[PDB]
Amino acid sequence: PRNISREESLQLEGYKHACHALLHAPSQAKLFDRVPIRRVLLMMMRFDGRLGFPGGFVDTRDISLEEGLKRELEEELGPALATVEVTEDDYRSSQVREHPQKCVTHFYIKELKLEEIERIEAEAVNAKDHGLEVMGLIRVPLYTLRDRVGGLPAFLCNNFIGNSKSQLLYALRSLKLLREDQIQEVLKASH
Amino acid sequence: PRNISREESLQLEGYKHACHALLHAPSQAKLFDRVPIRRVLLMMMRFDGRLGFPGGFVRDISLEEGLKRELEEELGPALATVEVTEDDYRSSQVREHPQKCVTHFYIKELKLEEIERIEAEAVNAKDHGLEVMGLIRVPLYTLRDRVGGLPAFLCNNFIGNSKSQLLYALRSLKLLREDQIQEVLKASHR
Numbered sequence: 001p002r003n004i005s006r007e008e009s010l011q012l013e014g015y016k017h018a019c020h021a022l023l024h025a026p027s028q029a030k031l032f033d034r035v036p037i038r039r040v041l042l043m044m045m046r047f048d049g050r051l052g053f054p055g056g057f058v059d060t061r062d063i064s065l066e067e068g069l070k071r072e073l074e075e076e077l078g079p080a081l082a083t084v085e086v087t088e089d090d091y092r093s094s095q096v097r098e099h100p101q102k103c104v105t106h107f108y109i110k111e112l113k114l115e116e117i118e119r120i121e122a123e124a125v126n127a128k129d130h131g132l133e134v135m136g137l138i139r140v141p142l143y144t145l146r147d148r149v150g151g152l153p154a155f156l157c158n159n160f161i162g163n164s165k166s167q168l169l170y171a172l173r174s175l176k177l178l179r180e181d182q183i184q185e186v187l188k189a190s191h
Numbered sequence: 192p193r194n195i196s197r198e199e200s201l202q203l204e205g206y207k208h209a210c211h212a213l214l215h216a217p218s219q220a221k222l223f224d225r226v227p228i229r230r231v232l233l234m235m236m237r238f239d240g241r242l243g244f245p246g247g248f249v250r251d252i253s254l255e256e257g258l259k260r261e262l263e264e265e266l267g268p269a270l271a272t273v274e275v276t277e278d279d280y281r282s283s284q285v286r287e288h289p290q291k292c293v294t295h296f297y298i299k300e301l302k303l304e305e306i307e308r309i310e311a312e313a314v315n316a317k318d319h320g321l322e323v324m325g326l327i328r329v330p331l332y333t334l335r336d337r338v339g340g341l342p343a344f345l346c347n348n349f350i351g352n353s354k355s356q357l358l359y360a361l362r363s364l365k366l367l368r369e370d371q372i373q374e375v376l377k378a379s380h381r
């Protein structure tokens with residue numbers, strides 16, 4: 001609920017802040033040699049059985065949003081994230097809420113080279129959080145299959161830690177991956 | 192949709208055969224140093240956006256042999272040493288609401304390190320980023336809120352009947368009693 005500015009969200013007192021990031025990379029691959037993958041988007045299965053974007057809570061009195069994100073990404077995704085600088089330019093949006101708890105979440109979006117994502121996936125099994133906070137990394141299917149369900153629509157029927165779905169739908173729009181009509185279709189096909 | 196025998200299946204006309212496996216290993220690890228993992232159970236995100244177990248379609252070789260082939264393709268080269276024998280066979284179902292289909296479910300215990308190596312090398316499998324969008328571990332615990340963990344996990348999208356197969360494994364491996372399973376299901380669909 002509510003799109004707040006970064007600058008205004010940061011000026012608030014007694015709010016709990018969170019940072020999450022969509023890491024992505026272009027791909028020339030085709031599923032079954034016919035269906036283009038287009039782009040690789042990382043999400044993860046969380047300890048709580050829900051899908052989410054990597055990241056977490058940041059205490060903005062101690063460290064910066066970016067520094068907090070950085071530290072959270074390393075724990076969740078592993079060493080490979082020491083070559084990766086998610087900076088202010090990667091920042092995208094911020095939502096604020098007061099119930100259940102005064103919470104602001106920030107959303108980042110960073111493009112990488114395909115092999116970087118691959119190095120990340122290869123090394124995520126060595127992350128401090130593997131098999132604990134993080135139950136596994138997954139790629140988001142951007143395609144719809146011949147049955148009009150399989151792929152993205154079906155994927156959106158999984159269980160998402162509150163708000164991550166909306167962030168994802170935001171990112172599909174912002175990266176020009178899907179038209180508004182296409183997103184609407186994907187949501188109907190899902191239901 | 193319907194329970195069946197291995198011999199009533201393998202001697203059926205028409206129908207296409209499928210094999211999937213739960214690979215699992217014990218674990219002493221603790222979430223937030225508090226909540227026991229108990230056991231590591233592999234599943235995966237499929238290309239179709241659904242969760243399922245690794246495996247697939249088998250007049251060919253044999254149920255064990257096909258499963259091995261699919262597991263190698265989907266999990267990587269590490270699998271070639273995993274036994275996956277008749278001793279690891281468990282059950283068979285018959286559906287007909289999407290062409291005559293027989294699913295054969297397998298459960299095999301490995302060593303934790305074996306599961307770990309499987310995860311690490313899965314990214315080099317033929318099917319990584321194609322048929323296989325990533326491996327996951329099944330959370331077996333339930334968090335303070337009485338939803339997070341297994342109950343919330345059961346609200347994800349499962350490819351036909353894999354959920355049923357999972358719930359069986361929880362009973363079969365004595366991880367949860369019947370009432371416990373019904374509790375997580377009640378919490379899940381609530």
Ligand SMILES: [Mn+2]
Pocket residue numbers: 055056057072076133
């Ligand atoms: Mn975290």
Ligand SMILES: [Mn+2]
Pocket residue numbers: 053054055056076
């Ligand atoms: Mn997190």
Ligand SMILES: [Mn+2]
Pocket residue numbers: 246247248261264265322
């Ligand atoms: Mn396969």
Ligand SMILES: [Mn+2]
Pocket residue numbers: 245246247248265322
């Ligand atoms: Mn398969």
Ligand SMILES: [Mn+2]
Pocket residue numbers: 246247248261
């Ligand atoms: Mn196959």
